[PDB]
């Protein structure tokens, strides 16, 4: 089984882990408190500290909020070359001078940041997307990473919508707030 990483242990991380297992992946979780977080996950999930989880995969969902990204800054060297999937949303349209994915890319300039899955609810990861809204919008400045995340979306039974460069991340982040 291919191993996919998730940083965080909240509702989104738990729901993502469900879907990843159901679709045939092995999951490693990086948590600040893995002994505590371990009960929030099945025994088949490897719950560990961030620095250990990162050695077990090259593709990591960053299932934390933007305001906590700098808590990972000391991992910069270990994260070099890894795909970081920015799943985040904000509470306001155009909240910051940069999109959350561009902010994450500025913190980890030698990682490969891909925006994706922010439009998917936790409940949708558990039950599946509605048949008329299976779409997940994906973008990145790195074409190869973008295509890997597009393929992961397909394996998770979503319809990936390729919006090209990371410049698209801002309006992808605005979309849940628009109607
Ligand atoms: N909930 C949802 O339905 C959706 C959420 N999202 C996005 O997913 C991401 C997570 O959302 P959600 O699960 O609801 O968020 P939570 O508020 O549950 O936070 C998630 C994780 O953040 C981690 N973390 C929390 N604080 C810190 C910190 N101070 N430093 C380092 N890590 C920290 C915790 O992991 P730990 O304690 O294990 O370290 C925690 O389990 C967000 O970006 C959100 O916008 C996207 C679509 C839907």
What are its keywords?
179 residues, alpha/beta, Rossmann fold, eight-stranded mixed β-sheet, 8 strands, binds NADPH dihydro-nicotinamide-adenine-dinucleotide phosphate
Q: Summed up, what is this model?
A:
With 179 residues, the chain is α/β, with parallel strands linked by helices.
Question: What is the element string, with H for helices and E for strands?
Answer: EHEHEHEEHEHEHEH
Largest sheet: 8 strands, mixed
- Shape estimate: globular
Name the helicity range: 25-40%
What's the quaternary structure here? monomer
Tally of domains: 1
Straight-line distance between termini: 38 Å
Second CATH tier, the architecture: 3-Layer(aba) Sandwich
CATH topology: Rossmann fold
PDB class: oxidoreductase
Keywords: Oxidoreductase
Assembly: monomeric
Entry title: Crystal structure of STEAP2 N-domain soaked with NADP+ (second collection)
Could you describe the 3D structure shown?
- With 179 residues, the chain is of the alpha/beta class.
- It has a single domain (3-177), classed as NAD(P)-binding Rossmann-like Domain (Rossmann fold, 3-Layer(aba) Sandwich), CATH 3.40.50.720.
- The protein has seven helices and eight strands, in the order E-H-E-H-E-H-E-E-H-E-H-E-H-E-H.
- Helix 6 (143-155) links the parallel strand 7 and strand 8 (159-162).
- The structure holds NADPH dihydro-nicotinamide-adenine-dinucleotide phosphate.
- NADPH dihydro-nicotinamide-adenine-dinucleotide phosphate (NDP) binds at residues 8-13, 31-33, 37, 63-65, 68, 71, 87-89, 118, 120-122.
- Belongs to the STEAP family.
């Amino acid at each position: 089984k291919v191993t996919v990483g998730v940083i965080g242990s909240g509702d989104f991380a738990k729901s993502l882990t469900i879907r990843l297992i159901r679709c045939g992946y092995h999951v490693v979780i990086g948590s600040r408190n893995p002994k505590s977080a371990s009960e929030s996950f099945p025994h088949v999930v490897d719950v560990t500290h961030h620095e250990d989880a990162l050695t077990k995969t090259n593709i990591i969902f960053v299932a934390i909020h933007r305001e906590h990204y700098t808590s990972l800054s000391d991992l910069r060297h270990l994260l070099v070359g890894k795909i970081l999937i920015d799943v985040s949303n904000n509470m306001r349209i155009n909240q910051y001078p940069e999109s959350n994915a561009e902010y994450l890319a500025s913190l980890f300039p030698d990682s490969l940041i891909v925006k994706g899955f922010n439009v998917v609810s936790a409940w949708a990861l558990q039950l599946g997307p509605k048949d008329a809204s299976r779409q997940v919008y994906i973008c990145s400045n790195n074409i190869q990473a973008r295509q890997q995340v597009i393929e992961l979306a397909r394996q998770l039974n979503f319809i990936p919508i390729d919006l090209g460069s990371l410049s698209s991340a801002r309006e992808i982040e605005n979309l849940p707030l628009r109607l």
